[PDB]
Design a protein around this ligand. Structure first.
Ligand SMILES: CS(=O)(=O)c1cccc(NC(=O)N(Cc2ccc(C(=O)Nc3nnn[nH]3)cc2)c2ccc(C3CCCCC3)cc2)c1
Length: 423
């Protein structure tokens, strides 16, 4: 029947945005509601959900405003359709920073953590305690003798030091110290059980302390290392603040303790980086959606700009979205090479936030950007093509499921709050 076919496609489209809107408002309420979920990774998801919530709001408003000059001729419709096209562009750019963040998350490690904290030295320096340090936090001997410190370093590097040591020589000795730091942990009976229970991100936080203090020094935190193994982060966080290490070096401790508490690199992140993501997700769409709106209102103004068949005014909204998808598939290919490299080299497990985030972000890129690339320069079997409306409606639900409902961290917050109710 012609009426039943046109009516059935309306149901699967409206229940699509109904299930999406609901799940996205629930998912956003979960990320804001639970205190331990307030991290950069989840704030980026909230801005992505916001673009799918406002897209659904345009869909529900268009449907509601049909209830009584026709709606196609009204200026209010054109504003709703402009707001709709702004949300579509925002979906593809909040998906872009979603891929950008993932890539930067795979690149940051212990070698970049310690390079920020320990810094870099070109010449041998007599440190405040009495030790001679050089490169990236490489101590030699406490003996007050520069002549013996240079002869000690010469045996460690190979060639004659003289004093000045290049960038490549410091990085070579820095890899040795980190390898000497992990062997110390695994050789220690009080550090190996907590290290093997910690995730790759909080493992680096434990290595960072051994790199500054030593295997026998951090082993003294018998009260703190026990509650880290028992997965009690915040109880250990306030415990490490009441230590000799926190009053000695507070700025370094604040960054290491946050990594044990949160399990992310946010204490090594810059606040202007997130300002550059909000300028990409909401700002860049605003640069090509308003000129498209201006030229469609001043020239191709006909039924909420439905008759989109005239000139290049169609490319000034499809090429910037195509560009966002081309770069998303480039990031897609590169991240897959990084993840498979880090998994085979045993530098990553399938239980880390970087691999879990890769299982969701690398799913959505060819799920939201594949259509735009296949039908790149095509404007306009009809029953089989109308099935596109179901994937455009339930894609809001899919973003909510992959970035919240399947997340292992939110499942911990529900299981923890559930136990708090009983006890
Ligand atoms: C090589 S790879 O393995 O790196 C990889 C690369 C690209 C895509 C995927 N696709 C994928 O793994 N799936 C299933 C799945 C399994 C686990 C999670 C998850 O636990 N996510 C999470 N946890 N915490 N936070 N986020 C999420 C998803 C997938 C596959 C296909 C679909 C569509 C099929 C058609 C219909 C619509 C869905 C959905 C998910 C893995």
């Amino acid at each position: 029947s012609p009426e039943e076919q046109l009516l059935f496609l309306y149901i699967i489209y409206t229940v699509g945005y109904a299930l999406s809107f609901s799940a996205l408002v629930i998912a956003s309420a979960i990320l804001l509601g639970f205190r331990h979920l307030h991290c950069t990774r989840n704030y980026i998801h909230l801005n992505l959900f916001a673009s799918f919530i406002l897209r659904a709001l345009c869909v529900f408003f268009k449907d509601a405003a049909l209830k009584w000059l026709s709606y196609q001729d009204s200026l209010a419709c054109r504003l709703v359709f402009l707001l709709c096209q702004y949300c579509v562009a925002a979906n593809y750019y909040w998906l872009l920073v979603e891929g950008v963040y993932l890539y930067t998350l795979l690149a940051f490690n212990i070698f970049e953590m310690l390079r920020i904290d320990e810094g870099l030295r070109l010449k041998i320096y007599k440190d405040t305690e009495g030790y001679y340090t050089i490169g990236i936090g490489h101590l030699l001997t406490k003996s007050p003798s520069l002549n013996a410190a240079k002869s000690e370093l010469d045996k460690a590097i190979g060639r004659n030091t003289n004093g000045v040591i290049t960038k490549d020589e410091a990085e070579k000795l820095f890899n040795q110290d980190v390898d000497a730091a992990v062997r110390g942990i695994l050789r220690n009976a009080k550090l190996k059980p907590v290290y093997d229970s910690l995730d790759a991100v909080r493992r680096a936080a434990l290595i960072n302390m051994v790199f500054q203090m030593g295997e026998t020094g951090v082993a003294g935190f018998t009260n703190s290392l026990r509650m880290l193994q028992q997965k009690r982060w915040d109880e250990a966080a306030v415990n490490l603040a009441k230590s000799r290490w926190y009053n000695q070096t507070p700025n370094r401790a604040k960054r290491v303790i946050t990594t044990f508490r949160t399990g992310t690199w946010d204490a090594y992140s810059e606040q202007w980086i997130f300002r550059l993501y909000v300028a990409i997700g909401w700002g860049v769409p605003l640069l090509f959606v308003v000129p498209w709106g201006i030229v469609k209102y001043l020239y191709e103004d006909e039924g909420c700009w439905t008759r989109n068949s005239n000139m290049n005014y169609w490319l000034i909204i499809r090429l910037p979205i195509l560009f966002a998808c081309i770069v998303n598939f480039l990031i897609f290919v590169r991240v897959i090479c990084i993840v498979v490299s880090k998994l085979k080299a045993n530098l990553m497990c399938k239980t880390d936030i970087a691999f879990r985030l890769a299982k969701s972000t690398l799913t959505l890129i060819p799920l939201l950007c594949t259509h735009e690339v296949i039908f790149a320069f095509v404007m306009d079997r009809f029953i089989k093509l109308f099935t596109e409306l179901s994937f455009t409606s339930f894609q809001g639900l899919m973003v909510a499921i992959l970035y919240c409902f399947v997340n292992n961290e939110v499942q911990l917050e529900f299981r923890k709050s559930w136990e708090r109710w009983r006890l």
